[PDB]
Amino acid sequence: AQYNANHPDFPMQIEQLERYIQRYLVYAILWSLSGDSRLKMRAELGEYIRRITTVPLPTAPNIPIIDYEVSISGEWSPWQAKVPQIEVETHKVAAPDVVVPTLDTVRHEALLYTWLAEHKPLVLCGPPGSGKTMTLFSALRALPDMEVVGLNFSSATTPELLLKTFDHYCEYRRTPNGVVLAPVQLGKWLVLFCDEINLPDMDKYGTQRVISFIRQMVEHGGFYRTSDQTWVKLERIQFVGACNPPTDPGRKPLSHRFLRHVPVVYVDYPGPASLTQIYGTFNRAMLRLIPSLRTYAEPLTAAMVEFYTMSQERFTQDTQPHYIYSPREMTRWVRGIFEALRPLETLPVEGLIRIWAHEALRLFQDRLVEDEERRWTDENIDTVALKHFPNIDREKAMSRPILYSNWLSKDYIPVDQEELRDYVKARLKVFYEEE
Amino acid sequence: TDGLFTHVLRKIIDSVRGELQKRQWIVFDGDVDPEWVENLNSVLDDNKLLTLPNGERLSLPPNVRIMFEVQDLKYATLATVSRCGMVWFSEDVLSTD
Amino acid sequence: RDPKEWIPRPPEKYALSGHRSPVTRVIFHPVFSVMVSASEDATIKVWDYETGDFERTLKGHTDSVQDISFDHSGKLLASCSADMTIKLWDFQGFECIRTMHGHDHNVSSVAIMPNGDHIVSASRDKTIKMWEVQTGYCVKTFTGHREWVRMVRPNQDGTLIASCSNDQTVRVWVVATKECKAELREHEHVVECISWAPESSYSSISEATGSETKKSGKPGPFLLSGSRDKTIKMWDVSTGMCLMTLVGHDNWVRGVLFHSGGKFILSCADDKTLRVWDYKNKRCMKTLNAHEHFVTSLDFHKTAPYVVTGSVDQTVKVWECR
Amino acid sequence: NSVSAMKLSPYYKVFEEDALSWEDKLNRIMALFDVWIDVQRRWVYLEGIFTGSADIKHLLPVETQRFQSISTEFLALMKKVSKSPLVMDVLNIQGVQRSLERLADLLGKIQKALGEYLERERSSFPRFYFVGDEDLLEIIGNSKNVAKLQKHFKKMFAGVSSIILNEDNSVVLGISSREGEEVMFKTPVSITEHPKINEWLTLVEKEMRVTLAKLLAESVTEVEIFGKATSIDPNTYITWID
Ligand SMILES: Nc1ncnc2c1ncn2[C@@H]1O[C@H](COP(=O)(O)OP(=O)(O)O)[C@@H](O)[C@H]1O
């Protein structure tokens, strides 16, 4: 219909319509029957479709069908055409708003925009830090008529949180057909983003009260106002959920009655190639601050990715609950290096490597419990830096007391231990008399 | 900050809503003593000005009449009595019938 | 030695060291060629800045002395200490003629009004009080600061007093009517020191900031406020706007003041350095490694080419200017 | 009045609902426009203050920024009005009454913050000391439209009730009194050459003084004939008086 509106002189023809509908039907089956599974399952489903369908399909020998979208003209077009190698502004490096385009990113954005346009509740499932909130917000940027309100569920979450959110952001107005709950602002659809939908505790009879409450509001279009036992109908209110996989500790599987109303998309961790692309773009944007260091973007990104991968593999939730590593730590790495490089007019390669190692220590070693894990982190930081940055001063870059502070200077520069100790002693002398 | 009489007179003078084209009568229904009525000495004289301490002077429009409705003048001075035309309403004017 | 252009030079003249505790503040005698320094050992030592010879110690305070000041004639010295007391010293006889109580906690600043008949002080109880010199009676209590008031300084004519506090704001009060003329809040950390702009620098400030000449003829009082965010900000008291921000200290700024000629800004910080700022170009000209530890205060002699800086290393230094 | 007269009529029972609706809408349009006229007047004589003065930005920065924002909002509302200039359309604007109330409050807040500016402008033209703050703001802000300044000349001059202007309203040709008596300036004062209110007002008063002096000289020359004369005819005396 939108294409017909865009072309009043040449409406859609029947042959183009049937081609488009067939291709989109195959695409929709693929993204509906495997959107909540890994990439391998999606490839298997695509292979089965290719083996059993009669619809024209992409000719690529190895590229799976799910990598191809359906253009409005009615032909398969690869998703790779919508992922350009952008150049991020230096002042927007690793910012929360900026999203580096990626095949998975664009596919998930299109899928969410498809589901969000119908005001259909949806759930994004995946490991923490994979990009569920990022993808949802990026998709919502394409829908100017929607306001997102973030709610964070926990083990003690009850429908009272939803009621407070409704009181803050919506109003109960009396209508001849009954009481209707709608957002205070007009013409906009309120989107309720629930970040931890599967944490709320199940009672001894296997029921989550807030999940049943959401199911009631979704299927029946409203709920009951317990103050006066009056049915309240929802208007212009939408639900979006995010959650870790149900197999994770502290997570409970969702009710099958609730799941039928919500399609589920699986947002997995970006692969080494995707991580390399994203953070190479970030480093290229970052390293333009110092022109002499521009040639070190690729080895720096490779070292970052390698160390992150080994840290993720070595430390898991089996040992400690807080041993969770994600692209969020990589983003914090890039942000830390960028903030350390902003005031510096120039810096040798050894200084950049020292900043890299300092940020690696601050992100991957602070949360470690045992001393052996910290020793492992130190040794592997040294080995990674040697491997990806050969022919550099080892001692100048990895003097073990890696300390950085802006207490002894206007900028964030390395600080000697003895000078810092003396300064902290004097500051403590002032601290005693002041605080 | 304008007082009640000052605000009324200024609103009449400004004539934002056509006050000057009407017949404006200001009636002072109450007691008269030199503390407040002597401030109207310039208003009730031929000057026709309401001089305020801030240096502002408000001219009396020709369509505005200053009215006093009093029961006695045992405290008004001669300056106040001199500046106005008196109409005497004896109690015999209003019979019980 | 241009009569209004000299700046201090890294060869120090003398390094006087007699204090047993960190030196709090150092000032110059307006008339005599004598220098007075206050320290945390409850002593106020008096030095001669030409020959670098110690003269005498003014004791009587129980706790650390936090601020000292002279009147216009130099015949009286007002000192405040951590024992909640302000003492008036007869500098001719070097005796304490009056001790003033009334502050509820540590008193961190004191100053004598330009008329010389009143004393203004700021303390930790978030109040600024005014005292008569003759009677020692408290007559005013400037309240409104939400935290420890660190400094108080009157302007040239004495009609305005400025104060800085731990509440990260600088307030300018009116002495006559006690009202707060302006509340200068742009520093991101605690404000340490303030200083007024002398009349000789009004034209220089106006031309450096690009401020158009007012039809009144008075550019308006200008104020400086060194703070712990390692920045110095010049303010316009009349409008309440920050004219410029001076960046370049590596630590908390402890003192700030103008050159008597009104062409440069002299400031000391805890980065162990004394810096000379060219506010015409909003840049720092010269940096002096003044002391081996934190620098607490500095003073600039009105006529003679001499700069004195106190420090926590218990040493008071005199700098020749060339 | 017509609605009330219908109300007192016995046949009003059948027409109660729509008559009440019209009463409500008339009351609401009156309530809206009563504050609208005042808000328009205040914006009119504040925009002149904040645009025709170059040093008000330096004297009152914060108030200047506040008024610039308020004027931007007022111009947005005025453009919305001009898009649909129907009285019912602007009446039915979402929150038009509330916007008018907040505009009136903000303009009043700005107006009370222009005290010292007025007390300083009084130094330019000395006769401004006998003019109220609201009247002074109206005079200074509305200097361009000299048609409405005719009501303020009686508060500054002994007998100059109004001034005489050309068709273009750009040159002062003379002054007038309350009785219609007029004095024609020998050298008319041009507002275009002296755009600021105070300079051309000072030129007007100086021209009035010199014009009265010259006319006194001419009248003395004309009347010396009547002196030292045994007999004086009526008609020449009457025309000299006129
Ligand atoms: N394509 C990409 N471009 C930029 N940043 C990305 C990309 N993919 C992942 N990230 C990073 O991964 C993180 C995703 O975390 P988040 O979306 O908050 O996880 P969750 O939604 O599970 O809470 C973001 O901080 C972002 O910086």
Dig out the tokens for A119 from the structure: 């005001």
Helices A14-33 and A39-52, packing angle to 10 deg: 140
How many CB atoms are closer than 10 A to CB B95? 6
- Cross-chain Cβ contact D37/B16 below 8 Å: yes
The closest CB to that of B55, out of D37, D130, D154, belongs to D130
Measured CA distances, A145 to A187, A236, C163 (Å): 7, 11, 51
C-alpha distances (whole Å) from C17 to each of C20, C40, C206 are 9, 14, 41
CA dist C8 and C264 (Å) reads 11
Is D58 at the interface with chain C, CB within 8 A?
yes
Q: Taking the CA of residue D72 as centre, how many other CA atoms within 13 Å lie in the half-sphere pointing to its CB?
A: 6
Establish whether residue A331 lines the binding site of ligand 1, counting it when its CB lies within 6 angstroms of any ligand atom. yes
- Decide: A122 and A135 in contact? Cβ < 8 Å: no
Cα separation, A31 vs A69, whole angstroms: 10
In terms of Cβ atoms closer than 10 Å to its own Cβ (0-12, 13-18, 19+), residue C131 is buried
Would you state the structure tokens that stand for residue C19, as one six-digit string?
Answer: 């204090």
CA end-to-end span of chain A: 69
CA distance C183 to C144: 10
The answer to whether residues A213 and A234 touch, using CB atoms and an 8 Å cutoff, is: no
Contact C249 A410 (CB under 8 A): yes
**Does any ligand 1 atom lie closer than 6 A to the CB of residue A131?**
yes
Would the CA dihedral through C48, C54, C56, C57 be positive or negative?
A: positive
For residue A146, the surrounding DSSP H or E stretch is: strand A146-151
Closest residue by Cα to atom 9, ligand 1, is A131
Min Cα distance A422 → chain C (Å) is 10
Which residue type sits at A59?
T
Structure tokens at A428: 């403590």
- Which long-range contacts (C-beta less than 8 Å, at least 24 apart) are formed by D84-89? D87/D29
Which of chain B's residues have a Cβ under 8 Å away from the Cβ of D131?
56
CA quadruple D37, D40, D42, D48: dihedral, nearest 10? -150
Identify the CA nearest to C79 among candidates C129, C25, C125: C25
Largest CA distance in chain D: 89
- List, in sequence order, every beta strand (DSSP E) within A3-80: 68-70, 76-78
Helix H or strand E encompassing D76 = helix D61-83
The number of beta carbons lying within 10 Å of the beta carbon of residue D169 is 12
Kindly report the protein residue whose alpha carbon is nearest to atom 25 of ligand 1: A328
- Is ligand 1 within 6 A of the CB of residue A263? no
Q: Which residues of A are annotated as a binding site for ATP?
A: 126-133
- Answer for the pair A244, A125: CB distance below 8 angstroms, yes or no: yes
Evaluate whether A131 touches A328 at the Cβ level (below 8 Å). no
* H runs (alpha helix) in C104-144: none
A186 within 8 A of A236, measured Cβ to Cβ: no
Q: Using CA atoms of A84, A88, A89, A95 in order, give the dihedral in degrees to the nearest 10.
A: 140
Contact C59, C42 (CB under 8 A): yes
Contact assessment for residue B28 and residue B67, using Cβ atoms and an 8 Å cutoff = yes
Where residue C202 falls (left for φ over 0; alpha for ψ -120 to 50; beta otherwise) is alpha
From CA C12, how far away is CA D164, in angstroms rounded?
78
Residues of D in contact with C240 (CB under 8 A): 62
Return the closest-CA partner of residue C249 out of C288, C223, C194.
Answer: C288
CA distances, D71 to each of D59, D62, D68, D76, D141 (Å): 19, 14, 5, 8, 14
Q: How far is CA B7 from the centre of its chain?
A: 13
* Ligand 1 atom closest to the CA of A327, numbered from 1: 12
Q: Which residues contact B7 (CB under 8 A, 6 or more apart)?
A: none
The answer for residues whose C-beta is within 8 angstroms of residue A174's C-beta and 6 or more apart is: none
- Does D129 sit within 8 Å of B56, measured CB to CB? no
Nearest to D49 by CA among D34, D35, D63, D37: D63
Q: Is D123 on the interface with C (CB under 8 A)?
A: no
Structure tokens at C77: 């010295």
| Nearest by Cα to D69 from D87, D54, D50 | D50
Name the H helices within chain C: 202-209
Q: State the angle between helix axes of A327-341 and A297-314 in degrees (0 to 180), rounded to the nearest 10.
A: 140
Kindly tell me the sign of the dihedral angle through the C-alpha atoms of A297, A303, A304, A306.
positive
Deposited resolution, Å: 2.9
- List all residues 6 or more positions away from B25 whose beta carbon is below 8 Å from its beta carbon: B64, B65, B67
